[PDB]
Amino acid sequence: GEIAQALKEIAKALKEIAYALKEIAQALK
Amino acid sequence: GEIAQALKEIAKALKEIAYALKEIAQALKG
Amino acid sequence: EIAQALKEIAKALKEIAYALKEIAQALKG
Amino acid sequence: GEIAQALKEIAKALKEIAYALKEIAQALKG
Amino acid sequence: GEIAQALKEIAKALKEIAYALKEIAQALK
């Protein structure tokens, strides 16, 4: 239902956050 | 209901955090 | 308890999103 | 100026993250 | 289960954001 849908969007968001942070780490290194 | 709504707003917040962090990465790379 | 917790976490994350947008602006710049 | 702003916003962000994490810890213990 | 999992990954994400921002502050100083 609506909880499962919410959690799918949270998973998507978190994948992009992980990627963004990898690029920030690279820049700083 | 309340849990579904809370989690939808958390998803929205996290998408804006993803965007913010992509702009920070770009800024730091020049 | 979990409904309340999740509402506070949503609020917190909206403030964090705003803070990070201002940090991005400063760093651009 | 830009460096002062960056540092002020980083301090704010870190305080909100500390609070967020306290709520997550409590939720998971609940 | 799925809400607990989501919250664990959000906690991880936020710890990495905190670390990234501390390194940015240090760089700027």
Side-chain angles (χ1 to χ4, degrees), chain A, chain B, chain C, chain D residues 1-14 16-30, chain E:
Chain A
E2 297 268 39
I3 293 170
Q5 181 59 36
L7 291 172
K8 295 177 204 317
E9 298 302 323
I10 290 168
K12 290 170 45 175
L14 287 171
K15 292 205 176 46
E16 291 207 50
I17 291 166
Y19 194 89
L21 289 168
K22 189 179 191 167
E23 290 207 62
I24 293 167
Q26 165 217 353
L28 290 172
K29 288 177 169 183
Chain B
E2 293 197 21
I3 299 290
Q5 287 175 243
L7 291 174
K8 291 179 201 172
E9 297 306 317
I10 289 170
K12 291 173 202 184
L14 289 171
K15 291 176 185 179
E16 294 307 317
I17 290 166
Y19 173 71
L21 289 173
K22 284 190 154 180
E23 294 298 314
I24 291 168
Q26 186 58 45
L28 291 171
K29 287 181 163 186
Chain C
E1 171 151 27
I2 188 65
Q4 185 57 33
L6 290 174
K7 294 178 204 168
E8 296 301 321
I9 290 164
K11 171 173 192 193
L13 288 171
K14 292 175 180 190
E15 188 62 38
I16 291 166
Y18 166 55
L20 288 171
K21 287 178 186 187
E22 294 295 316
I23 291 165
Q25 287 295 106
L27 291 174
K28 287 176 157 175
Chain D
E2 296 91 315
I3 293 174
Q5 168 72 6
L7 291 174
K8 172 177 59 157
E9 301 301 358
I10 288 167
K12 164 188 174 75
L14 290 169
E16 295 289 353
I17 290 167
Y19 272 83
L21 289 170
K22 171 268 282 198
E23 294 296 338
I24 292 167
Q26 285 177 146
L28 290 172
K29 288 177 200 290
Chain E
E2 291 256 327
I3 295 170
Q5 186 59 36
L7 292 171
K8 292 177 174 177
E9 298 180 17
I10 292 167
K12 175 185 153 292
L14 288 170
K15 290 176 189 187
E16 294 302 316
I17 292 165
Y19 178 74
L21 289 176
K22 286 176 204 187
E23 294 300 309
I24 293 167
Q26 187 58 47
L28 291 170
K29 288 178 199 155

